[PDB]
Amino acid sequence: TSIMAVTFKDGVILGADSRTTTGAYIANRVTDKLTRVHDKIWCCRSGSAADTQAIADIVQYHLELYTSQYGTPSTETAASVFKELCYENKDNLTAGIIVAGYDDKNKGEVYTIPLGGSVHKLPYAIAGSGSTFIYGYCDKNFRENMSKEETVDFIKHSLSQAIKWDGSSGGVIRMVVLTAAGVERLIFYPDEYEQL
Amino acid sequence: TSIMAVTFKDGVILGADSRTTTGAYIANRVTDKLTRVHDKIWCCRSGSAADTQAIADIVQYHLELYTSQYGTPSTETAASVFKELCYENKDNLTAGIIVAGYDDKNKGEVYTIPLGGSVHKLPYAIAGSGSTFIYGYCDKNFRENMSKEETVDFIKHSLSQAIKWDGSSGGVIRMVVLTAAGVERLIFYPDEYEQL
Amino acid sequence: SDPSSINGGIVVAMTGKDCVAIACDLRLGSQSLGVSNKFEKIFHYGHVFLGITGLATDVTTLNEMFRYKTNLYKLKEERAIEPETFTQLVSSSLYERRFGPYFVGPVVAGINSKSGKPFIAGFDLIGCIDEAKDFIVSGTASDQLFGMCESLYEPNLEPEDLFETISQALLNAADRDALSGWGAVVYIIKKDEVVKRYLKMRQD
Amino acid sequence: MDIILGIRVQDSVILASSKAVTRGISVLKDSDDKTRQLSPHTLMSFAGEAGDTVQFAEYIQANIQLYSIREDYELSPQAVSSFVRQELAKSIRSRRPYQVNVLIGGYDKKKNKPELYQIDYLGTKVELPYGAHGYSGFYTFSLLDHHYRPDMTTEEGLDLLKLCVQELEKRMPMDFKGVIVKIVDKDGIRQVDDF
Amino acid sequence: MDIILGIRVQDSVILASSKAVTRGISVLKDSDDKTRQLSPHTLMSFAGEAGDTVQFAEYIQANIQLYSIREDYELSPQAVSSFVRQELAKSIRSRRPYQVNVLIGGYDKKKNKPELYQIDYLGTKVELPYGAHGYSGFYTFSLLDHHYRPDMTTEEGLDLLKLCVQELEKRMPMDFKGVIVKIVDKDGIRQVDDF
Amino acid sequence: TTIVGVKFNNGVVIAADTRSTQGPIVADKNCAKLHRISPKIWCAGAGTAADTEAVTQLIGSNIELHSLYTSREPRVVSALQMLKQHLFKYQGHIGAYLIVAGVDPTGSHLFSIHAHGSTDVGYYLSLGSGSLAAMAVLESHWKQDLTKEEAIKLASDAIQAGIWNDLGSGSNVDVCVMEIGKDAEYLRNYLTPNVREEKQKSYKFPRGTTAVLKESIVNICDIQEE
Amino acid sequence: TTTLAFKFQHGVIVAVDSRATAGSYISSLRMNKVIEINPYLLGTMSGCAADCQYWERLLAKECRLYYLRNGERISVSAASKLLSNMMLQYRGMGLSMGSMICGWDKKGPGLYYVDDNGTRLSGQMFSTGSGNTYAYGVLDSNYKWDLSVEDALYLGKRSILAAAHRDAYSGGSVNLYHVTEDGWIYHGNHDVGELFWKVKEEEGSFNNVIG
Amino acid sequence: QFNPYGDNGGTILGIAGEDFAVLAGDTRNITDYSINSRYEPKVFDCGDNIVMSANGFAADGDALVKRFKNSVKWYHFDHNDKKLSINSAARNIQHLLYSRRFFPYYVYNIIAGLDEDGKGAVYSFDPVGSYQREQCRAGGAAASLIMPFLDNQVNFKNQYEPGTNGKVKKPLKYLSVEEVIKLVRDSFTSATERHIQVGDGLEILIVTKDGVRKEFYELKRD
Amino acid sequence: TQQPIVTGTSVISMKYDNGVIIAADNLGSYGSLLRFNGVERLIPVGDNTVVGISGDISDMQHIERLLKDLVTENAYDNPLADAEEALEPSYIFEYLATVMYQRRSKMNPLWNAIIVAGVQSNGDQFLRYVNLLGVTYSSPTLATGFGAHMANPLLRKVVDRESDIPKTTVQVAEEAIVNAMRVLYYRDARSSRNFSLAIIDKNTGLTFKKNLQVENMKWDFAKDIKGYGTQKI
Numbered sequence A, B: 001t002s003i004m005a006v007t008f009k010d011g012v013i014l015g016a017d018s019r020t021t022t023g024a025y026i027a028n029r030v031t032d033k034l035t036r037v038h039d040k041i042w043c044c045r046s047g048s049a050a051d052t053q054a055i056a057d058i059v060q061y062h063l064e065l066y067t068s069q070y071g072t073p074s075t076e077t078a079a080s081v082f083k084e085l086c087y088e089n090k091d092n093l094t095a096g097i098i099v100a101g102y103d104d105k106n107k108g109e110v111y112t113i114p115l116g117g118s119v120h121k122l123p124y125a126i127a128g129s130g131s132t133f134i135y136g137y138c139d140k141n142f143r144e145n146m147s148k149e150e151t152v153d154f155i156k157h158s159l160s161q162a163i164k165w166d167g168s169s170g171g172v173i174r175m176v177v178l179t180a181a182g183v184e185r186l187i188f189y190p191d192e193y194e195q196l
Numbered sequence C: 001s002d003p004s005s006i007n008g009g010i011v012v013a014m015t016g017k018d019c020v021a022i023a024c025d026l027r028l029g030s031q032s033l034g035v036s037n038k039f040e041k042i043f044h045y046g047h048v049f050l051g052i053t054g055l056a057t058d059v060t061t062l063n064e065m066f067r068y069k070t071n072l073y074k075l076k077e078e079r080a081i082e083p084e085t086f087t088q089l090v091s092s093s094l095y096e097r098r099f100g101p102y103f104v105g106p107v108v109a110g111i112n113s114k115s116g117k118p119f120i121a122g123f124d125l126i127g128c129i130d131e132a133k134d135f136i137v138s139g140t141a142s143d144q145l146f147g148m149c150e151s152l153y154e155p156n157l158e159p160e161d162l163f164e165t166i167s168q169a170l171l172n173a174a175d176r177d178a179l180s181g182w183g184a185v186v187y188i189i190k191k192d193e194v195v196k197r198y199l200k201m202r203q204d
Numbered sequence D, E: 001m002d003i004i005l006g007i008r009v010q011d012s013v014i015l016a017s018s019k020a021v022t023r024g025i026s027v028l029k030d031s032d033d034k035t036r037q038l039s040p041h042t043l044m045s046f047a048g049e050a051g052d053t054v055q056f057a058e059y060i061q062a063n064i065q066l067y068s069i070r071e072d073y074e075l076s077p078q079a080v081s082s083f084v085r086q087e088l089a090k091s092i093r094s095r096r097p098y099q100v101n102v103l104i105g106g107y108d109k110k111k112n113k114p115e116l117y118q119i120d121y122l123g124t125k126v127e128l129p130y131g132a133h134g135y136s137g138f139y140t141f142s143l144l145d146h147h148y149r150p151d152m153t154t155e156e157g158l159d160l161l162k163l164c165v166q167e168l169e170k171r172m173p174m175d176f177k178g179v180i181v182k183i184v185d186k187d188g189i190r191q192v193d194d195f
Numbered sequence F: 001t002t003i004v005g006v007k008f009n010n011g012v013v014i015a016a017d018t019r020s021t022q023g024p025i026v027a028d029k030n031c032a033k034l035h036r037i038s039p040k041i042w043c044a045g046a047g048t049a050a051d052t053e054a055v056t057q058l059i060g061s062n063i064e065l066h067s068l069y070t071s072r073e074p075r076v077v078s079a080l081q082m083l084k085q086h087l088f089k090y091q092g093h094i095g096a097y098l099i100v101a102g103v104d105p106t107g108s109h110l111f112s113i114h115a116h117g118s119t120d121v122g123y124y125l126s127l128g129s130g131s132l133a134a135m136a137v138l139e140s141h142w143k144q145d146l147t148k149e150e151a152i153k154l155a156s157d158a159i160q161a162g163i164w165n166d167l168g169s170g171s172n173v174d175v176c177v178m179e180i181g182k183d184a185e186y187l188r189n190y191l192t193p194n195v196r197e198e199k200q201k202s203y204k205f206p207r208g209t210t211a212v213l214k215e216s217i218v219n220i221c222d223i224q225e226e
Numbered sequence G: 001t002t003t004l005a006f007k008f009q010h011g012v013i014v015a016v017d018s019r020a021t022a023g024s025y026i027s028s029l030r031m032n033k034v035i036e037i038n039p040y041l042l043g044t045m046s047g048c049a050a051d052c053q054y055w056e057r058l059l060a061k062e063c064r065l066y067y068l069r070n071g072e073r074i075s076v077s078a079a080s081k082l083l084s085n086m087m088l089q090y091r092g093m094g095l096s097m098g099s100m101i102c103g104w105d106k107k108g109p110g111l112y113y114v115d116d117n118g119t120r121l122s123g124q125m126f127s128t129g130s131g132n133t134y135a136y137g138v139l140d141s142n143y144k145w146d147l148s149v150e151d152a153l154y155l156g157k158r159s160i161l162a163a164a165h166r167d168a169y170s171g172g173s174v175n176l177y178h179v180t181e182d183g184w185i186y187h188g189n190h191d192v193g194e195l196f197w198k199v200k201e202e203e204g205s206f207n208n209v210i211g
Numbered sequence H: 001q002f003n004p005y006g007d008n009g010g011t012i013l014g015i016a017g018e019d020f021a022v023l024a025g026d027t028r029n030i031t032d033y034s035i036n037s038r039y040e041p042k043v044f045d046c047g048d049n050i051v052m053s054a055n056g057f058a059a060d061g062d063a064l065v066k067r068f069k070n071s072v073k074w075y076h077f078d079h080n081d082k083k084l085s086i087n088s089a090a091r092n093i094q095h096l097l098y099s100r101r102f103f104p105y106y107v108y109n110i111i112a113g114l115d116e117d118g119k120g121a122v123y124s125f126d127p128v129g130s131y132q133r134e135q136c137r138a139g140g141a142a143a144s145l146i147m148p149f150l151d152n153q154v155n156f157k158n159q160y161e162p163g164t165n166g167k168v169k170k171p172l173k174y175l176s177v178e179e180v181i182k183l184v185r186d187s188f189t190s191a192t193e194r195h196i197q198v199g200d201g202l203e204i205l206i207v208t209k210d211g212v213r214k215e216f217y218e219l220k221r222d
Numbered sequence I: 001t002q003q004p005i006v007t008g009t010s011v012i013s014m015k016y017d018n019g020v021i022i023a024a025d026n027l028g029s030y031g032s033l034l035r036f037n038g039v040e041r042l043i044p045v046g047d048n049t050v051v052g053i054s055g056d057i058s059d060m061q062h063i064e065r066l067l068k069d070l071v072t073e074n075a076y077d078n079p080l081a082d083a084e085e086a087l088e089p090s091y092i093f094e095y096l097a098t099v100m101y102q103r104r105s106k107m108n109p110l111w112n113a114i115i116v117a118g119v120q121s122n123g124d125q126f127l128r129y130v131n132l133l134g135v136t137y138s139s140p141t142l143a144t145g146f147g148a149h150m151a152n153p154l155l156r157k158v159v160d161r162e163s164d165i166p167k168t169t170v171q172v173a174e175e176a177i178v179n180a181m182r183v184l185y186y187r188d189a190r191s192s193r194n195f196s197l198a199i200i201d202k203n204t205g206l207t208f209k210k211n212l213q214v215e216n217m218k219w220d221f222a223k224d225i226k227g228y229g230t231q232k233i
Ligand SMILES: *[B]([O])([O])[C]([C][C]([C])[C])[N]C(=O)[C]([C]C1=[C][C]=[C][C]=[C]1)[N]C(=O)C1=[C]N=[C][C]=N1
Pocket: A001, A002, A019, A020, A021, A022, A027, A031, A033, A045, A046, A047, A048, A049, A050, A052, A128, A129, A168, A169
């Protein structure tokens, strides 16, 4: 699995591959790992598919109920609900989640939640088995306040390399753009990103 | 450990960090992992220090005896002697070696020998625990027929990132330049390569 | 299971003024069962004395081995072996079985016949020499012996005073060890006279 | 096998050894003689792992008989016991050690003294007035410690031995099917056919 | 514990149970009665893990005695055996199962018939003419298969039982210190004091 | 165990503590961990005590024969090579962790050697359970172009760090100085900062306190004439 | 550890050693392995010291409460059963206890063996601990119902000595008790070291040992 | 796997005099081959003229002492400020230890003070709650080193009177507080030499009818 | 029972004449991967206490929240919350020590090693350690993990015993701490160059220094080191 979320001038973009594996067999080659927990709060999922689905579903329920009572929740609040589940059930879970969202007040924010259930707010985050191969590339090429087009190219190039080297990663590159304008879904196929 | 060998227009350059670890304790912070087996045939060592030293010593003995009888050996020949030891004693060894050398006929050549004892001739090679973090960077930034100055910058930047992310890698960046002109040793300290 | 504590036993040696002392218990057991109260652990090859604790079969085997080697030494050298030389022979012999060792804790004691200097030494099961000035301990009550020797011992004791010190060190250490006791022997050694004394102790 | 006892009295050595041999859950034999005559005045009883016992005993027997023929002379019980100990001490560090415990009862014709030696499979030798192997001593040594004198007659030794067997028969969970008793003295070796 | 036998003859049920109790390597007792009277015409012998046996037996005894008082009526051996089986089948899936095997010998006063039930710790019940638990059957069933008739007298049942005990005493490695024999018939339960 | 090695202007110095342990027990309070391979090649040893001595004597013996065969003074690189190949062959089972130093016709040298056979070069080194306490001192105070007097001080200060802070190290400090163009000076018990205080009481017993059963003279002499 | 107890014509004898071990180290030279539950009830101890002390002292609480409720002393049979039922609650939980409940009641003298498994046995003579086999040897050959109080006290004392000598985990001293219908009577602490030499000379036993 | 236990080393020593008692213990705290503290108090004044030390696993030792101190406080509240006698304290501690029979306090515990007749008293406990009154007891890491010495120098074991040759024992004469403190200091000095976990400092608490007094002595720091 | 995932290495500290100093690097390691480079492991509680934490970072963040809630709770119905009834270092420590020991007793520990550094109301220095086992001890110098093996020896050369504390100034103590952090960067494979340092003085109060770096490092001698024995080039 190769997932990442990157903040930029106009908001935040989430990115992911589409491969689900049972050992070396690809159980699903068109998986959607970019998941919606609120209108403009999404997450990237890595680890157990059952665990991360169950968590995201519970979070979506919590934020729907939050909204009914207190109005639109912050991205930090959403990350806290994820954390609470991942931390308190750490013994029985295998879930590496990146939380990303857009406020008008706070703009684009990214929170990463690794295995232990700790929380880390970052300008950008990478995770999944394939992220190991792009720590060098991403550190060297990331800049703050990039444009939408620059950020899309950054994620496209980064996940391209992660897919190239990681067997657990592959398929299409899915992306989700979170800005004031709304929510845009993007997709990039092998013939496009392999030749980079 | 972060090691690499890169061919370029005028020959080949070997590069390495200087960290030796016993768990999390750094047993030696100024290690020389770039080892000479012949005048212009050197190797990069990763894995067990005892195993790789013992191997390199035996190889140096074989090539010294080869030279006395048949004259200067090729880089391919040197890689074969390494392979023969690493393959036939695979059950008892833990050694990841990169062999690099300069002929006038064949110019700069690089052979990588991973754990199994297989041989792979490449334009450039990376190895060691820290190499995982720079697969993306190195694939994106490597070009064939680079200049000496470009190649030094490529290795410097690459190992800089490998050191940054890998705990088993660190210290100084040692380099060895192999060309027709002769053998040049280079060294780059933390204050230089960390700010890259 | 542990070979060094199946049979049980202890040995202690001390230096004095122009004299040495070496003592041992007499117990031989099979774990909890007491088998023999006459199993002496101190042997001598000329004027050099050797005490051996640990696995009883190896104690017996090594005695027979060092008797063998010291008897040949004497035939060739035309003189008795000295404590310093014997100590090196013990070390050499034990290390040659580095990866299949005799499960023993030897102790050498004696006086050099030429210099007159008192000498004691201890070994681990594989030959490391501990050449102490004051005392050497070995056996299943080695912890107990260390505590007794370290508090009771003082340098330059006369033979008849040294006897009391080493005896009390052995006796009270043995009485806090389940695998040691059932009698005790003390050798008092001077340059040209050696006295051997059996001690009266509790038989449980 | 299970039970072997030994007692040295004034003018003889008496060895008592169980008669049972068990395979799986069935007692195959109740008249087994767990002993070999090494020389006319030396008897060895044995107990340990199945098969190893007899094969070791017969190997020792053959070596002593060979010595007797070569020198036209009977080895002392002490010499025999030392030979046996060395073979076991040699054996314990072998690839597959012989798991055999023995008692050697002999009458030394030179010194005119009976002698009893106890040797375990490690090669641990001890000369004793009375001895046993395995758990046998746990039940019997308290009686022997109490009743044993060195000036006892052969008949008194047998009575004390009967008492030891009675105690074993009462407190041991295993049925060892009684014992065969043999006496070693100046006149040689003989078996007590009623015990 | 070790040995429990049962045999149903013409007009009675005979139970034989070993007397030995062993702890560690020592036999603590050689007169232990491994049985409980559940009702005037129902006897239960038992064998299994230490402690569990007696506590299970006494728990069953208490339940049957409670039933007897409540209804002023003695349960049939079949009813008792079914109650016991249910308690064991309940027990086997518990946190810590009771490791107890039983034989229930009873005389049904309604049908005027002796009845023998064999129940193991899993709750496996079978009605038999003769039965045993553990290894006891391996030695004895061949004799019972040969000699047993359903019209045997109590005296003939005891003679066949003696033969079974003699075979056990010959071929079993363990000394079980003889057996206590009890007879269950129309007149109730009595112990054979000489066996 | 704490052992160190420090290079200086015209030579090299090694040092060590004097404690030997088995579990939490001290077997020897004044152990000698400094070994002579050849007159001007000494090594300090940590790990299994019999192994450090044995492997040191063996290579020292073969070095002596080599010196006689070649009519030359032995080199540190020779001892280094012979030790590592021997240790490598036994795949770490010979538990010898050594700091090898010395002077020879090539100059002054300092190496470390691990049980599996790996060697390391440095200006300052430390091995053993107290190597971290010692290395902390070395990393704090070491500099290039040390004098003989400064290097001995640094080395002994590094050993003291081990003595005080590591329970596997204790007692005294041994030193050996190997300077170019001079005899090597072995300074046994260079420091003695752990002398036991006077006891409160004398435990000398009255003669006759111990109960005796039998007495006998032991014949240690040979069979006599006449 | 070696403990014994036996019934006879004049009541019951109770004898124990006093050694406590932590591996091969002798932790205690003088451990009290008898508990005075009441003036007519005793309890021996073998196995885990903590378990033996706690559960037998808790038995004493429960035996005392019996007296208050019923105005009458508890039987040896009932006391032993309360203890066995306590052991049955911590069934398989790892308790190590071997005890003999010795006393005098309306049925006369009473002696019950009880252990951690819940086993409860009535009998004339028992012996528990690592040295019980040595004690049984002396007891079985010398025991009679027709024993005098003086000889019976010696038998129990001599039987412990036999075990203390041979068993490495038994020794220290001998504690003697005699239970009558007027209650138990303590017959002192006897050092084995001194007792051994005394018995050797007077009895002539332990000939193989030199002294 | 998580190991809830640890070993903080240390050694303790209790000696009962005729009208006094001492409870001593080294001040060194360790894990494996490192020193945590050269001065970490281990012997505590628990009130009512009772001193206590729980040696072994420090976390369990601190918890037990804390609980016993609490038990003394509630004994005053519940029983009209009555003084907790040393024998009553000992029995109370047995029940504190056995409450964790199946997850024990990993400590060897000693208390010292005066009995109800004014005589010196020492009680010793194992981790699961077995206890017994004694005259002399060393506990902890170097317990096996010290106890034999105390058998010899406090109870005069294996010591006979000269001239008689084993027939008459050395009479059991009582020891003064000054004599006892010498044996304590020599015990810990000897233990420090041969045991790596013993050293740094020695703290002694002396109990008399007058109260609880402290004495501190340096030990070797290697 | 668990295993630590994202971890923090050594925390080092020492007493000086007028207060205490504590320091810890800004790294959150993920095994051998030096994953997170901006992690603060010193957490101030009021203006008189700093809690330094090593070990599992998720458990650290949990403890950080307990302390934040402890301050909130202490202010409730407390007019002297910023004065006489403010939280003391000893109160904060004992609370944590209670939590750590309770968690280990439920076989579900907080996988940490904690040092509470501060100054009490009466001006006394407070420095005490607690870990996942509930083990507690105090000393003039304290350190966790690698710091225990490398930092303590250096810091104990400045303050070897209690009587050395009044003789040690804040300049000397800070110098020793900063040197120790450099040594740990040389020798600890799970350390970073960037660290935080906090001083709690009885006169000048709490000084919290962020974004410090290890400087004045010696590496030049590396150029002269060639091969592993015989190699000359
Ligand atoms: B990715 O590899 O982490 C991926 C992300 C997931 C949210 C779709 N996980 C998986 O493919 C996992 C296995 C795995 C591979 C690599 C690292 C961690 C986990 N697979 C499943 O969860 C799975 C596979 N087959 C059926 C059902 N679930």
